[PDB]
Short mmCIF file of C-alpha atoms in Angstrom, two decimals:
data_model
loop_
_atom_site.label_atom_id
_atom_site.label_comp_id
_atom_site.label_asym_id
_atom_site.label_seq_id
_atom_site.Cartn_x
_atom_site.Cartn_y
_atom_site.Cartn_z
CA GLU A 1 -18.62 -0.55 -20.40
CA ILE A 2 -15.76 -2.50 -21.96
CA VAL A 3 -15.14 -5.82 -20.21
CA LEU A 4 -12.09 -7.97 -20.96
CA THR A 5 -12.35 -11.75 -20.49
CA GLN A 6 -9.20 -13.85 -20.42
CA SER A 7 -9.00 -17.55 -21.15
CA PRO A 8 -8.04 -19.99 -19.81
CA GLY A 9 -8.23 -19.12 -16.12
CA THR A 10 -5.21 -21.34 -15.39
CA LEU A 11 -2.70 -23.10 -17.65
CA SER A 12 -0.27 -25.81 -16.50
CA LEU A 13 2.48 -26.64 -19.02
CA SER A 14 5.92 -28.21 -18.94
CA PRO A 15 9.13 -26.19 -19.42
CA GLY A 16 9.96 -25.82 -23.08
CA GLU A 17 6.33 -25.71 -24.20
CA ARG A 18 4.47 -22.70 -25.58
CA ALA A 19 1.61 -21.10 -23.65
CA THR A 20 -1.23 -19.47 -25.61
CA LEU A 21 -3.33 -16.94 -23.69
CA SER A 22 -6.45 -15.26 -25.03
CA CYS A 23 -8.19 -11.98 -24.20
CA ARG A 24 -11.63 -11.11 -25.59
CA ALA A 25 -13.20 -7.66 -25.33
CA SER A 26 -16.96 -7.27 -25.00
CA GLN A 27 -16.84 -4.84 -27.95
CA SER A 28 -14.22 -4.12 -30.59
CA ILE A 29 -11.41 -2.02 -29.11
CA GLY A 30 -8.66 -2.15 -31.74
CA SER A 31 -5.12 -3.43 -31.52
CA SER A 32 -3.81 0.03 -30.70
CA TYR A 33 -5.65 -0.03 -27.35
CA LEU A 34 -4.55 -3.36 -25.87
CA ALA A 35 -1.57 -4.31 -23.73
CA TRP A 36 -0.28 -7.33 -21.83
CA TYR A 37 1.40 -7.52 -18.41
CA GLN A 38 3.16 -10.14 -16.29
CA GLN A 39 2.84 -10.15 -12.51
CA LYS A 40 5.11 -12.52 -10.59
CA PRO A 41 4.47 -13.29 -6.92
CA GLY A 42 5.15 -10.32 -4.69
CA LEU A 43 6.14 -7.99 -7.52
CA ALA A 44 4.51 -5.10 -9.36
CA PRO A 45 3.07 -5.75 -12.83
CA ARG A 46 5.55 -5.60 -15.72
CA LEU A 47 4.56 -4.36 -19.15
CA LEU A 48 5.25 -6.96 -21.85
CA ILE A 49 3.48 -5.70 -24.96
CA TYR A 50 1.46 -2.68 -26.01
CA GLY A 51 -0.58 -2.03 -29.11
CA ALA A 52 -1.37 -5.77 -29.16
CA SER A 53 1.97 -6.74 -30.68
CA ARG A 54 4.70 -4.20 -29.86
CA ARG A 55 7.18 -5.48 -27.29
CA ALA A 56 8.17 -3.05 -24.56
CA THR A 57 11.77 -2.03 -24.02
CA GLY A 58 13.96 -4.96 -23.02
CA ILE A 59 11.22 -7.61 -23.38
CA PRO A 60 12.53 -10.80 -25.02
CA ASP A 61 11.02 -12.36 -28.12
CA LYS A 62 9.66 -15.32 -26.15
CA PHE A 63 6.66 -13.03 -25.50
CA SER A 64 4.60 -12.38 -28.63
CA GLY A 65 1.24 -10.67 -29.07
CA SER A 66 -1.28 -10.77 -31.89
CA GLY A 67 -4.92 -10.12 -32.70
CA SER A 68 -7.31 -7.41 -33.78
CA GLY A 69 -10.73 -5.93 -33.08
CA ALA A 70 -11.97 -7.69 -29.95
CA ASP A 71 -9.79 -10.85 -29.87
CA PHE A 72 -6.16 -10.91 -28.77
CA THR A 73 -3.54 -13.52 -27.97
CA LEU A 74 -0.29 -13.62 -26.04
CA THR A 75 2.11 -16.50 -26.63
CA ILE A 76 4.92 -17.36 -24.21
CA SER A 77 7.42 -19.67 -25.87
CA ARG A 78 10.15 -21.76 -24.26
CA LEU A 79 8.49 -21.73 -20.86
CA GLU A 80 10.72 -21.93 -17.80
CA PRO A 81 9.92 -22.25 -14.08
CA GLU A 82 10.59 -18.54 -13.61
CA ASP A 83 7.69 -17.69 -15.98
CA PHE A 84 5.23 -18.65 -13.21
CA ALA A 85 3.04 -15.56 -12.98
CA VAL A 86 -0.40 -14.16 -13.59
CA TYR A 87 -0.65 -12.53 -17.01
CA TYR A 88 -3.15 -9.71 -17.52
CA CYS A 89 -4.49 -7.96 -20.58
CA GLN A 90 -5.45 -4.28 -20.34
CA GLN A 91 -7.47 -2.00 -22.58
CA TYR A 92 -7.13 1.77 -22.60
CA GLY A 93 -9.88 2.58 -25.08
CA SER A 94 -11.77 4.06 -22.12
CA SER A 95 -10.63 6.29 -19.26
CA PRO A 96 -9.78 4.72 -16.96
CA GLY A 97 -9.18 1.55 -18.88
CA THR A 98 -9.71 -1.91 -17.50
CA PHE A 99 -7.84 -5.16 -16.96
CA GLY A 100 -8.82 -8.72 -17.67
CA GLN A 101 -9.19 -11.11 -14.75
CA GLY A 102 -5.80 -12.73 -15.43
CA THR A 103 -4.55 -16.14 -16.56
CA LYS A 104 -2.34 -17.99 -14.08
CA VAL A 105 0.47 -19.77 -15.91
CA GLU A 106 1.69 -22.73 -13.84
CA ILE A 107 4.85 -24.59 -14.80
CA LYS A 108 4.36 -28.36 -14.63
CA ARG A 109 7.06 -30.71 -13.38
CA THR A 110 7.45 -34.38 -12.56
CA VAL A 111 6.50 -35.96 -9.23
CA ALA A 112 8.82 -35.10 -6.35
CA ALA A 113 8.62 -36.53 -2.85
CA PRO A 114 8.54 -34.18 0.16
CA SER A 115 11.36 -33.93 2.63
CA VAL A 116 9.71 -34.03 6.05
CA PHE A 117 10.77 -32.30 9.25
CA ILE A 118 9.13 -32.02 12.68
CA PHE A 119 9.66 -29.21 15.21
CA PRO A 120 8.87 -29.30 18.91
CA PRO A 121 7.37 -26.26 20.63
CA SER A 122 9.83 -23.71 21.90
CA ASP A 123 10.41 -23.51 25.63
CA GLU A 124 9.36 -19.86 25.38
CA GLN A 125 5.93 -20.65 24.00
CA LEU A 126 5.47 -23.51 26.45
CA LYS A 127 6.22 -21.31 29.46
CA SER A 128 3.40 -19.09 28.20
CA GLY A 129 0.99 -22.04 28.29
CA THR A 130 0.57 -23.30 24.71
CA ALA A 131 2.43 -25.83 22.55
CA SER A 132 2.53 -25.46 18.76
CA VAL A 133 4.04 -28.46 16.97
CA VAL A 134 5.00 -27.97 13.30
CA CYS A 135 5.49 -30.52 10.52
CA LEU A 136 7.15 -29.27 7.33
CA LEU A 137 6.75 -31.01 3.95
CA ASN A 138 9.39 -29.44 1.74
CA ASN A 139 9.75 -29.19 -2.03
CA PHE A 140 7.24 -31.67 -3.39
CA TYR A 141 4.93 -32.12 -6.36
CA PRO A 142 2.01 -32.40 -7.01
CA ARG A 143 0.26 -30.41 -4.30
CA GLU A 144 -1.89 -33.23 -2.87
CA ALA A 145 -0.53 -34.61 0.38
CA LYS A 146 -1.97 -36.20 3.52
CA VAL A 147 -0.59 -35.36 6.98
CA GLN A 148 -1.60 -37.36 10.02
CA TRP A 149 -0.60 -36.40 13.55
CA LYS A 150 -0.08 -39.06 16.20
CA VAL A 151 0.45 -38.44 19.91
CA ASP A 152 1.55 -41.57 21.83
CA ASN A 153 0.37 -43.50 18.72
CA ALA A 154 -3.13 -41.97 18.93
CA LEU A 155 -4.47 -40.25 15.80
CA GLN A 156 -5.24 -36.58 16.36
CA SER A 157 -8.31 -34.72 15.12
CA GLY A 158 -9.52 -31.14 15.25
CA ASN A 159 -6.32 -29.44 16.42
CA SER A 160 -4.28 -29.05 13.23
CA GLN A 161 -4.14 -26.61 10.35
CA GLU A 162 -2.31 -26.53 7.02
CA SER A 163 -0.83 -23.86 4.78
CA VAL A 164 0.77 -24.41 1.37
CA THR A 165 3.01 -22.16 -0.70
CA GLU A 166 2.53 -21.30 -4.33
CA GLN A 167 4.74 -23.12 -6.81
CA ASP A 168 8.38 -22.11 -6.41
CA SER A 169 9.71 -19.90 -9.18
CA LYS A 170 12.98 -21.86 -9.50
CA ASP A 171 11.90 -25.53 -9.24
CA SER A 172 8.08 -25.47 -9.46
CA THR A 173 7.56 -27.38 -6.22
CA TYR A 174 5.30 -26.77 -3.24
CA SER A 175 5.96 -26.78 0.47
CA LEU A 176 3.40 -27.26 3.24
CA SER A 177 3.20 -26.65 6.96
CA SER A 178 0.92 -28.54 9.33
CA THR A 179 0.59 -26.99 12.78
CA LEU A 180 -0.81 -28.95 15.72
CA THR A 181 -1.74 -26.75 18.68
CA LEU A 182 -2.21 -28.10 22.20
CA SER A 183 -2.51 -26.61 25.64
CA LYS A 184 0.58 -26.93 27.80
CA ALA A 185 -1.35 -29.28 30.11
CA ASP A 186 -2.32 -31.60 27.27
CA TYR A 187 1.16 -31.49 25.73
CA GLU A 188 2.76 -32.50 29.02
CA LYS A 189 0.47 -35.58 29.27
CA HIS A 190 2.13 -37.39 26.35
CA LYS A 191 5.62 -38.27 25.19
CA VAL A 192 5.89 -39.12 21.48
CA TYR A 193 4.77 -36.59 18.87
CA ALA A 194 4.77 -37.68 15.25
CA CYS A 195 3.63 -36.55 11.83
CA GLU A 196 3.10 -39.12 9.10
CA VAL A 197 3.05 -37.99 5.49
CA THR A 198 1.52 -39.71 2.46
CA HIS A 199 2.34 -38.39 -1.01
CA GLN A 200 2.47 -39.69 -4.59
CA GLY A 201 6.26 -39.48 -4.68
CA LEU A 202 6.84 -41.55 -1.54
CA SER A 203 7.13 -45.32 -1.91
CA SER A 204 5.71 -45.54 1.63
CA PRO A 205 4.50 -42.89 4.08
CA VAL A 206 7.22 -41.09 6.02
CA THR A 207 6.95 -40.48 9.76
CA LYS A 208 9.07 -37.98 11.71
CA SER A 209 8.80 -37.84 15.49
CA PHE A 210 10.33 -36.44 18.65
CA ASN A 211 10.00 -37.12 22.36
CA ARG A 212 8.83 -34.31 24.62
CA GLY A 213 11.74 -32.79 26.51
CA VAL B 1 12.81 6.65 -13.86
CA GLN B 2 11.04 5.66 -10.66
CA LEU B 3 7.79 6.15 -8.80
CA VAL B 4 8.05 5.94 -5.00
CA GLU B 5 4.85 5.53 -2.99
CA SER B 6 4.08 6.30 0.62
CA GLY B 7 1.08 6.74 2.88
CA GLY B 8 -0.34 3.24 3.21
CA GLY B 9 -1.48 1.74 6.47
CA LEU B 10 -4.45 0.66 8.56
CA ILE B 11 -7.51 2.92 8.73
CA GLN B 12 -10.96 2.38 10.15
CA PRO B 13 -14.03 2.18 7.88
CA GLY B 14 -15.40 5.58 7.01
CA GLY B 15 -11.97 7.10 7.52
CA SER B 16 -9.66 8.87 5.11
CA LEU B 17 -6.12 8.26 3.87
CA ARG B 18 -3.91 10.07 1.36
CA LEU B 19 -1.37 8.13 -0.70
CA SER B 20 1.60 9.84 -2.37
CA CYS B 21 3.65 8.85 -5.44
CA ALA B 22 6.84 10.86 -5.82
CA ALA B 23 8.21 10.66 -9.36
CA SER B 24 11.83 10.83 -10.50
CA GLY B 25 12.87 10.98 -14.14
CA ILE B 26 9.43 11.83 -15.53
CA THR B 27 7.28 14.94 -15.02
CA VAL B 28 3.90 13.95 -13.53
CA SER B 29 2.16 16.93 -15.09
CA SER B 30 3.21 15.92 -18.62
CA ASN B 31 1.82 12.39 -18.37
CA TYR B 32 -1.19 10.26 -17.92
CA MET B 33 -0.84 8.98 -14.34
CA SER B 34 -2.95 6.28 -12.69
CA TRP B 35 -3.72 4.44 -9.50
CA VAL B 36 -4.24 0.68 -9.87
CA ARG B 37 -5.10 -1.53 -6.92
CA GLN B 38 -4.77 -5.22 -6.26
CA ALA B 39 -7.09 -6.70 -3.64
CA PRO B 40 -7.27 -10.38 -2.66
CA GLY B 41 -8.94 -12.31 -5.46
CA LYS B 42 -9.72 -9.16 -7.48
CA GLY B 43 -6.79 -9.09 -9.93
CA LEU B 44 -5.79 -5.57 -10.93
CA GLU B 45 -8.39 -2.79 -10.79
CA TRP B 46 -7.68 0.49 -12.55
CA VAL B 47 -9.35 2.95 -10.25
CA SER B 48 -8.28 6.40 -11.50
CA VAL B 49 -6.39 8.19 -14.26
CA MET B 50 -5.34 11.83 -14.52
CA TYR B 51 -4.59 13.21 -17.97
CA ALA B 52 -1.64 15.46 -18.65
CA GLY B 53 -4.00 18.41 -18.64
CA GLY B 54 -5.55 17.52 -15.29
CA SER B 55 -8.83 15.88 -16.27
CA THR B 56 -9.61 12.97 -14.01
CA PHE B 57 -11.59 9.76 -14.47
CA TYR B 58 -12.61 7.13 -11.93
CA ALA B 59 -13.87 3.61 -11.77
CA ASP B 60 -17.47 3.51 -10.59
CA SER B 61 -16.34 1.61 -7.52
CA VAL B 62 -14.54 4.68 -6.15
CA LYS B 63 -16.25 7.62 -7.87
CA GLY B 64 -17.29 10.26 -5.33
CA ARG B 65 -14.96 8.95 -2.60
CA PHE B 66 -11.49 9.04 -4.17
CA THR B 67 -9.72 12.06 -5.68
CA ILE B 68 -6.54 12.00 -7.74
CA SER B 69 -4.43 15.15 -7.73
CA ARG B 70 -0.86 16.29 -8.25
CA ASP B 71 1.62 18.88 -6.97
CA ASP B 72 3.79 19.95 -9.88
CA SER B 73 6.37 21.66 -7.66
CA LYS B 74 6.97 18.41 -5.75
CA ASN B 75 6.49 16.28 -8.89
CA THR B 76 4.14 14.09 -6.86
CA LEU B 77 0.82 12.36 -7.53
CA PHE B 78 -1.75 11.84 -4.78
CA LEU B 79 -4.79 9.65 -4.15
CA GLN B 80 -7.07 11.08 -1.45
CA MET B 81 -9.35 8.29 -0.26
CA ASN B 82 -12.40 9.25 1.78
CA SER B 83 -15.26 7.20 3.18
CA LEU B 84 -13.09 4.10 3.07
CA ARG B 85 -14.71 0.65 3.01
CA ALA B 86 -13.42 -2.85 3.72
CA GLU B 87 -13.69 -3.50 -0.04
CA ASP B 88 -10.95 -0.85 -0.57
CA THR B 89 -8.33 -3.03 1.17
CA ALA B 90 -5.59 -3.62 -1.37
CA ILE B 91 -2.06 -2.91 -2.50
CA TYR B 92 -2.21 0.41 -4.34
CA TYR B 93 0.16 1.11 -7.21
CA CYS B 94 0.73 4.35 -9.02
CA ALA B 95 1.78 4.11 -12.64
CA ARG B 96 2.59 6.19 -15.72
CA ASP B 97 0.40 5.33 -18.72
CA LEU B 98 1.30 6.00 -22.35
CA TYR B 99 -1.97 4.71 -23.81
CA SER B 100 -1.48 3.95 -27.51
CA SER B 101 2.05 5.38 -27.39
CA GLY B 102 3.34 2.69 -25.06
CA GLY B 103 1.08 1.06 -22.50
CA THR B 104 1.58 1.38 -18.75
CA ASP B 105 5.34 1.07 -18.49
CA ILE B 106 6.39 2.53 -15.13
CA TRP B 107 4.96 1.22 -11.85
CA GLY B 108 5.53 2.17 -8.24
CA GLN B 109 6.44 -0.43 -5.66
CA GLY B 110 2.95 -0.57 -4.13
CA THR B 111 1.67 0.43 -0.67
CA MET B 112 -0.79 -1.58 1.40
CA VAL B 113 -4.06 -0.03 2.58
CA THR B 114 -6.06 -2.02 5.12
CA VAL B 115 -9.53 -0.82 6.10
CA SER B 116 -10.66 -2.47 9.30
CA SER B 117 -12.08 -1.68 12.71
CA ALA B 118 -10.32 -4.67 14.33
CA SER B 119 -7.62 -4.00 16.90
CA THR B 120 -3.95 -4.11 15.89
CA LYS B 121 -1.86 -6.94 17.35
CA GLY B 122 1.89 -7.38 16.95
CA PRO B 123 3.11 -10.91 16.30
CA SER B 124 4.69 -13.38 18.68
CA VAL B 125 7.78 -15.03 17.18
CA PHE B 126 9.00 -18.46 18.30
CA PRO B 127 11.91 -20.54 16.97
CA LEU B 128 11.36 -23.76 15.01
CA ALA B 129 14.46 -25.85 15.80
CA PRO B 130 14.94 -29.61 15.35
CA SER B 131 15.06 -31.75 18.47
CA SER B 132 18.40 -33.11 17.19
CA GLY B 133 20.01 -36.96 5.77
CA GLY B 134 22.45 -34.06 5.63
CA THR B 135 19.90 -31.24 5.42
CA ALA B 136 18.34 -29.48 8.38
CA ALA B 137 15.31 -27.27 8.51
CA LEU B 138 14.93 -24.27 10.79
CA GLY B 139 12.12 -21.79 11.07
CA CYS B 140 10.13 -19.26 12.99
CA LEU B 141 6.49 -19.40 14.00
CA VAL B 142 4.80 -15.96 13.71
CA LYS B 143 1.69 -16.18 15.80
CA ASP B 144 -1.50 -14.18 16.30
CA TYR B 145 -1.07 -10.81 14.61
CA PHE B 146 -3.41 -8.38 12.90
CA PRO B 147 -3.65 -7.02 10.20
CA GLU B 148 -1.67 -8.63 7.44
CA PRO B 149 1.06 -8.45 6.34
CA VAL B 150 4.22 -9.39 8.15
CA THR B 151 7.57 -9.43 6.36
CA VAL B 152 9.93 -12.27 7.27
CA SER B 153 13.61 -12.36 6.35
CA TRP B 154 16.55 -14.49 7.42
CA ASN B 155 19.94 -13.14 8.49
CA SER B 156 18.77 -9.60 7.63
CA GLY B 157 18.00 -10.62 4.06
CA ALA B 158 21.34 -12.28 3.37
CA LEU B 159 19.84 -15.79 3.51
CA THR B 160 17.28 -16.28 0.74
CA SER B 161 18.07 -19.67 -0.79
CA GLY B 162 15.70 -22.32 0.48
CA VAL B 163 13.43 -19.92 2.34
CA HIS B 164 9.69 -20.59 2.31
CA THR B 165 7.24 -18.28 4.09
CA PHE B 166 3.77 -19.78 4.25
CA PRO B 167 0.54 -17.90 3.62
CA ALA B 168 -1.04 -16.66 6.82
CA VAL B 169 -4.13 -18.41 8.15
CA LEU B 170 -6.92 -16.43 9.79
CA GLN B 171 -7.71 -18.09 13.11
CA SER B 172 -11.08 -18.27 14.84
CA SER B 173 -9.87 -15.45 17.12
CA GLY B 174 -9.62 -13.12 14.14
CA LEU B 175 -5.80 -13.06 14.29
CA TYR B 176 -3.35 -14.42 11.72
CA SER B 177 -0.47 -16.91 12.05
CA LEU B 178 2.19 -18.28 9.75
CA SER B 179 5.60 -19.93 9.77
CA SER B 180 8.75 -19.25 7.78
CA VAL B 181 11.30 -22.01 7.19
CA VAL B 182 14.71 -22.45 5.61
CA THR B 183 16.80 -25.52 4.84
CA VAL B 184 20.56 -25.51 5.40
CA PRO B 185 23.30 -28.15 5.55
CA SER B 186 23.23 -30.05 8.82
CA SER B 187 27.00 -29.56 8.92
CA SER B 188 26.51 -25.79 9.08
CA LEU B 189 24.52 -25.79 12.32
CA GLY B 190 27.56 -25.52 14.62
CA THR B 191 29.39 -23.00 12.47
CA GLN B 192 27.08 -19.98 12.66
CA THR B 193 23.84 -18.48 13.96
CA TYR B 194 20.57 -18.24 12.04
CA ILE B 195 18.21 -15.35 12.81
CA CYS B 196 14.72 -14.65 11.57
CA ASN B 197 13.64 -11.04 11.23
CA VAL B 198 9.92 -10.32 11.51
CA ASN B 199 8.57 -6.88 10.69
CA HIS B 200 4.97 -5.79 11.26
CA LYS B 201 4.46 -2.20 10.20
CA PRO B 202 0.95 -1.73 11.69
CA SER B 203 2.29 -2.37 15.22
CA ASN B 204 5.64 -0.73 14.42
CA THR B 205 7.41 -3.88 15.56
CA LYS B 206 10.64 -5.50 14.35
CA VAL B 207 11.59 -8.79 16.05
CA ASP B 208 14.89 -10.66 15.57
CA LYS B 209 14.79 -14.25 16.86
CA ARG B 210 17.81 -16.51 17.06
CA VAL B 211 17.01 -20.05 15.97
CA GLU B 212 19.51 -22.20 17.84
CA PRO B 213 19.58 -26.02 17.75
CA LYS B 214 18.26 -27.61 20.93
#
């Protein structure tokens, strides 16, 4: 069968630069049988180019395709944050055709410190018997960050979990949630709840806290 | 020119499900039409095509279990999926292909198919409000649901700037949890109400939670 291999797997470039994406077929397929697609987060794929180099209706010239035989290239010029997407090649020399595995195009930016917020558990959840405490790290870059939870100035272990968004399509930053979960009984045993954040963009770690009640 | 899909949902392994793709502005029977699916970590997988004349072709991964068909009078394309497997969990798209005359230019909106024997659980929604720099954050915690996905909006979709909805995490219980947050001016907190709207189609639930400062 025909297999398409895209390279690189991921590309991280600054706005204004040109991205060069490659697609190699395991046998010659011909330019007439290759197309390129963009898929942004949460959206359906969008046709960019067909026949290796023909732009689809309404597609701007920043997207350009070239190549022949088994080797094809897509260039994306004048990159912008909104170009963050996975780009796929497709061949339709077989029925059905096949897609490449995709190249993720990440838009680089400069270091940005997180804005940090802490949320107490809701009275509703507490009445039910559990306390979830949430620390938000908002709009930062790069992705690496350390969150430490302190309860009455005692470092916590084993009771927290993190989730991080993909890069934002407008400003290329990340956000992160850290959720500390305690039983109601344990929560009511302590007063001061704090999250302390370390990140490249902070001159010193930032702590946000609240007092129970 | 649009393709509108329906029929997705949760189904147990070994079960069957039929997806529909109702076309407007193109005639299904005059076109190559396809189903393409997107599973976690599996990119796009082109699973079936039907030629204008009705010949059908399948990816090996679905051959013998899936059947593409069409109803010309309803101008609708179908995917009948039998003997479903966990590996078939994905967003399914229908699409119109032009092959060398134009690529795959028209895509449906996608419908989620989840193949699982685990029990369905609607989410619990709790407000994230500061205990209270000029900016405030508010949010909602969406706890212990199954299967994915939930859809979270703010103020019925009217508030989108500054919203971040985190990927769900699968807990040791087998249920998922996530939070959604938004940042707003601190000076706006006494001038209006912020509401998060959480929809979970598998449990047929729609929750609206006011997020009031404490």
